[PDB]
């Protein structure tokens, strides 16, 4: 199972780790992708997860979008986890660099409650532009299921742990 995580709350754990390397090691039931509405996995966590699947995630995602259309900001879909996990839960947090409503971050985290355990990044953090301290706060106050957060950046991980209320 998950190792080396710091326990933040009854159900939220955190580790300074590359979510791709973490997924390859744990092979969790669910890995969360920091997706956009088009499932265009170009950069950030999405680009990294997709590259690890040798682009199979993007091929599957394009077929999903061709059939279903785009996701909503705050929404999700369950697709294959490929070589990384049983499933990938593609969750769209608001991208504040695209002027999206930060209030939708709670709706985005609510998707995690449909899965008993997940390996996840902080939603809307990184290239999505939100404050990761705020994202962790919304995560702990919204997610009730077991969430193992992988924070790529060591300096950000230390700031998140040291400032956690």
Ligand X SMILES: NC(=O)c1cnc(C(F)(F)F)nc1
60 binding ligand X? (CB under 6 A): no
User: For ligand X, which stretch binds (CB under 6 A), given 25-33, 42-50, 53-61, 136-144?
Assistant: 42-50
- Residues forming a β-bridge with 149: 14, 120
Which residue's CB comes closest to ligand X?
Answer: 48
Q: Write phi, then psi, for 141 (nearest 5 degrees).
A: -85, -5
**Interface with ligand X includes 91 (CB under 6 A)?**
no
CB of 34 to ligand X, least distance (A): 8
| Cβ density class 91-108: b for 16+ within 10 Å, e for less | bbbbbeeeebebebbebb
Q: Which residue has the tokens 């957060």?
A: 149
Does residue 48 interact with ligand X by CB under 6 A? yes
Q: Is 40 in the site for ligand X (CB under 6 A)?
A: no
Would you give the binding string for ligand X spanning residues 117-146, x where CB under 6 A is met? ---------x--------------------
| Closest CB to ligand X among residues 126, 132 | 126
| Residue 18 touching ligand X (CB under 6 A) | yes
Tokens of 120: 């996840």
20 binds ligand X (CB under 6 A): yes
Q: Indicate the DSSP class of residue 98.
A: G
Q: Which letter does DSSP use for residue 70 in this model?
A: P
Strand 12-16 relative to strand 6-7, pairing: antiparallel
Binding residues (CB under 6 A) for ligand X: these are 18, 20, 44-45, 48, 126, 152
């Amino acid at each position: 199972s998950f190792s080396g995580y710091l326990k933040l709350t009854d159900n939220v754990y955190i580790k300074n780790a590359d979510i791709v390397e973490e997924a390859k090691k744990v092979k969790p039931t669910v890995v969360v992708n920091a997706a956009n509405v088009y499932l265009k996995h170009g950069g950030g966590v999405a680009g990294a997860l997709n590259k690890a699947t040798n682009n199979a995630m993007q091929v599957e995602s394009d077929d999903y979008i061709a059939t279903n259309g785009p996701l909503k900001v705050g929404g999700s879909c369950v697709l294959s986890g490929h070589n990384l996990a049983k499933h990938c839960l593609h969750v769209v947090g608001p991208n504040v660099n695209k002027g999206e409503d930060i209030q939708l971050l709670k709706s985005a985290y609510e998707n995690f409650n449909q899965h008993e355990v997940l390996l996840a990044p902080l939603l809307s953090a990184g290239i999505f532009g939100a404050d990761p301290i705020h994202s962790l706060r919304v995560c702990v106050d919204t997610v009730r299921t077991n969430v193992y957060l992988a924070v790529f950046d060591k300096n950000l991980y230390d700031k998140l742990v040291s400032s956690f209320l």
